[PDB]
Symmetry: D2
Subunit: 74 residues, 4 copies
């Protein structure tokens, strides 16, 4: 369950991968990214997008299981 460093690294990498050059620079400094303890070479591309995707899907599935209810509800 997710730390500030982890979300900061995910965001930093999103800005980099999307060519948000000015934001990447400012954010790397403001979030103190160099002092974080994450091995970037082990972080796959589109990691933020992908986890966030799966978050949306996860909520959709949490909803759809209770979507119909049962014919015995009362």
């Amino acid at each position: 369950s997710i730390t500030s460093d982890e979300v900061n690294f995910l965001v930093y990498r999103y800005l980099q991968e999307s060519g948000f050059s000015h934001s990447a620079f400012t954010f790397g400094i403001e979030s103190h990214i160099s002092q974080s303890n994450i091995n970037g070479t082990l972080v796959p591309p589109a990691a933020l997008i992908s986890i966030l995707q799966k978050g949306l899907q996860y909520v959709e599935a949490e909803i759809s299981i209770n979507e119909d209810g049962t014919v015995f509800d009362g």
Copy 2:
């Protein structure tokens, strides 16, 4: 399927809310965040990412 604009708005709000003043300012421009917010509550990037890890841990428990 999450769009670019949607991700961008989610991180913009995260930057604002986390007090990353200079990043929010710069990202707001670079994003062209047209400079419904109302439907994006606080901590929304974080909340969705948290659901995503829950989902990843479900694939890892296959």
Copy 3:
């Protein structure tokens, strides 16, 4: 009497020319540099500052 806009344009051009990419970008917005350039040649902040020190050294030689 140098105006704000004039100083701002002089530093904006200095930031651009010196390769301070992120500062120029951010300053261009913060300055509202309306986003005649043609009349402001390269190294113009520097050249005027250099004349100013020449003038300061003339007051120091009073």
Copy 4:
């Protein structure tokens, strides 16, 4: 005769004094201001504006001395 560090410090202080918060931040990092060797407490307010002023005046005076020429020119 003026170094990059000096003009960078002058500019940094201009952005600060004018409340250009976002630019000051970015520029302090990009110009590596912390590694410069200038004692800020000895730098007066509006220093950039003032030296730049005096530069304009200095050029005006360089011009005005040759403005009329003489009645013996030929």
